[PDB]
Design a protein around this ligand. Structure first.
Ligand SMILES: O=c1ccn([C@@H]2O[C@H](COP(=O)(O)OP(=O)(O)O)[C@@H](O)[C@H]2O)c(=O)[nH]1
Ligand SMILES: [Mn+2]
Lengths: 494, 9
């Protein structure tokens, strides 16, 4: 074993450098050339609030087992993660660093780091994904507190003590640092805004939420107080080890990446614990726009399946808004969830309604319209009743965005409806004026269909299209469908 | 597709 300053980073990183002409983003979807230029212990700016710097940390804190899983990580980024932990953490609080090599292409990426003081390397015999890889590390951990980090992170000054302090006081707090940004193109370390919380929209993709005016005002007494958060990112958090185990680890049927941070956030809040972001704790993370690795079965499929498993277990009736937002997820089998449903039951977890009202009151229920009401627009003109009733013609007029004569609905009956009147093809002879008549289910003259990417209206069972060319000489007509601006119509929602 | 970056300071 060597102390990390004696580790031969040049030999290690030199084995896998990008060659001349080669794409520096191909392997990792960040710039490996810029990662490889950095020293393993490169200095980073202290991004903490001034109030953090005047802090003495409770002394008798529990040591942690740091679990880092990785799959085909750049050697420079993985090493720099390990070193940031060893250099920026008090040694007596680092029991061990467990690297879980999740079936990387090259087993030396991990094996060579095994040389370093306090590093334990666990290589998976097959691809396991981050969830099962994290449970593997966590099951192997000897300490009383778990820390999970992604494999391209850089810990900052006194990042660890503020997290440990929270968990030492209350074992049911699951806590994360502010996620500073390591730029994926040039690897500069930049501080994140401290005014953020974790959240999601109904498509159940994690996002950062900006604090409301009132939330910020309430924090002026102490801007470094813990931020209670509806959701944590997955890349860095600290959790009491027994709490992790008792509360159900991670869902072992989740694969590769995605949705475990959603699942664990719901679980922790619904089953009586809490989530916090801790401003005095800062850890940089290389954010990316694409995953560099394979998803056995397809990245869309996998992510949807993982999310279904979380939604079906935690979200009660609210899961319906996810399927509404992501219809395609309905097509994705998700396997057996009994273990997880029973876990929820055993722990007497609270309903999702409880979470929305008490944890994430900012998330607004989606706004439902089974039917399209609005304008049928052609440039700056709108389909207009002209103020006519049954047997009158229709036309186009400057859009006034005031509904009225310019408000229509596209019915499931395949009609074009204003109140109880429908656009009626009284004569199929090309060039004929259409008329309003009372809507009847059984009037084939009143049936229209949107065609060409919802850009024209064709009369069902004909090759006739609604046409405005006759507007100045009597009103809208049916005309043979062809390339004419006068046959273009966009339904614009109210 | 991936965890998004927070807005910077
Ligand atoms: O099959 C996989 C996929 C991902 N990871 C690791 O899990 C973390 C989360 O993945 P990533 O950084 O790709 O996600 P992002 O942070 O972009 O959302 C990283 O340490 C990965 O190397 C893994 O061990 N196995
Ligand atoms: Mn990551």
């Amino acid at each position: 074993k060597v102390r990390w300053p004696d580790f031969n980073q040049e030999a290690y990183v030199g084995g896998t450098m990008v060659r001349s002409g080669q794409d520096p983003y191909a392997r990792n979807k960040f710039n490996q050339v810029e990662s490889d230029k950095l020293r393993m212990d490169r200095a980073i700016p202290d991004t903490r609030h001034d109030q953090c710097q005047r802090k003495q940390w409770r002394v008798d804190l529990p040591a942690t087992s740091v679990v880092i899983t990785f799959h085909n990580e750049a050697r420079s980024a993985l090493l720099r993660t390990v070193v940031s932990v060893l250099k920026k953490s008090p040694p007596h609080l680092i029991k061990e660093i467990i690297l879980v090599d999740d079936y990387s292409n090259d087993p030396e990426d991990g094996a060579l780091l095994g040389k370093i003081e306090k590093v334990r390397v666990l290589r998976n015999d097959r691809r396991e994904g981050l969830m099962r890889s994290r449970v593997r590390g966590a099951d192997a951990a000897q300490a009383k507190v778990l820390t999970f980090l992604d494999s391209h992170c850089e810990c900052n000054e006194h990042w660890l003590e503020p997290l440990l302090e929270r968990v030492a006081e209350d074992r049911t707090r699951v806590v994360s640092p502010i996620a500073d940004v390591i730029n994926m193109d040039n690897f500069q370390y930049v501080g994140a805004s401290a005014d953020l919380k974790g959240g999601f929209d109904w498509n159940l993709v994690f996002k950062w939420d900006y604090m409301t005016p009132e939330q910020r005002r309430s924090r002026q007494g102490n801007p470094v107080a813990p931020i209670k958060t509806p959701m944590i990112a997955g890349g860095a958090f600290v959790m009491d080890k027994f709490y992790f185990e008792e509360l159900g680890k991670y869902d072992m049927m989740m694969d590769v990446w995605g949705g475990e941070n959603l699942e664990i956030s719901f679980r922790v809040w619904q089953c009586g614990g809490s989530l916090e972001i801790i401003p005095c704790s800062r850890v940089g993370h290389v954010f990316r726009k694409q995953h560099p690795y394979t998803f056995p079965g397809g990245s869309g499929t996998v992510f949807a399946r993982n999310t279904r498993r979380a939604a079906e277990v935690w979200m009660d009736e609210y899961k319906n808004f996810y399927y509404a937002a992501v219809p395609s997820a309905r097509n994705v089998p998700y396997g057996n969830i009994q273990s997880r449903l029973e876990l929820r039951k055993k722990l007497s977890c609270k309903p999702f309604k409880w979470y929305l009202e008490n944890v994430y009151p900012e998330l607004r229920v989606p706004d439902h319209q089974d039917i399209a009401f609005g304008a049928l627009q052609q440039g700056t003109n709108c389909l207009d009743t002209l103020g006519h009733f049954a047997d009158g013609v229709v036309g186009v007029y400057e859009c006034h965005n005031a509904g009225g004569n310019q408000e229509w609905a596209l019915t499931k009956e395949k009609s074009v409806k204003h109140m109880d009147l429908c656009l009626t093809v009284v004569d199929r002879a090309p060039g004929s004026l259409i008329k309003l008549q009372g809507c009847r289910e059984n009037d084939s003259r009143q049936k229209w269909e949107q065609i060409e990417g919802n850009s024209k209206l064709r009369h069902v069972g004909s090759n006739l299209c609604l046409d405005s060319r006759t507007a100045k000489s009597g009103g809208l007509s049916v005309e043979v469908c062809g390339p004419a601006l006068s046959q273009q119509w966009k339904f614009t929602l109210n | 597709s991936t965890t998004p970056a927070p807005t910077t300071k």
